[PDB]
Amino acid sequence: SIATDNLQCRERRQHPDLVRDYVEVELLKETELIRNIQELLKRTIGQAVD
Amino acid sequence: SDRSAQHELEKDLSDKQAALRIDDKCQHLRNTSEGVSYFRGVERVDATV
């Protein structure tokens, strides 16, 4: 959620400034990392209960 | 400037109409049809804005 708010607020900006670098790229990396983390957690807990 | 603005509008028209064709193909998909296939894996997929 923090990262989503970060990207949203950064999107909120005035006309003559709209740029893109690692900041956006690295934040996207954060989001993807997070999602992969959740999926792996769920699979591990499944094996544990079995 | 007039023609430029037109251009943007028709660009949008084109992409949306392509989407309509795709989702008509979606709609009229029916049980026990031909193109149905077991594809596996790609459900938890979101590259979406």
Binding site: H15, L18, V19 | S4, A5, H7, E8
Partner: peptide, 28 residues
């Protein structure tokens, strides 16, 4: 002129700024 340089800069399998031929360009 500018045409050749924009072609040179934006051609690869990497990213792409939509510096179009004419008309309004992308805000980003």
């Amino acid at each position: 002129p500018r045409k050749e340089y924009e072609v040179a800069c934006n051609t690869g399998a990497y990213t792409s700024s939509g510096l179009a031929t004419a008309g309004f360009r992308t805000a980003k």
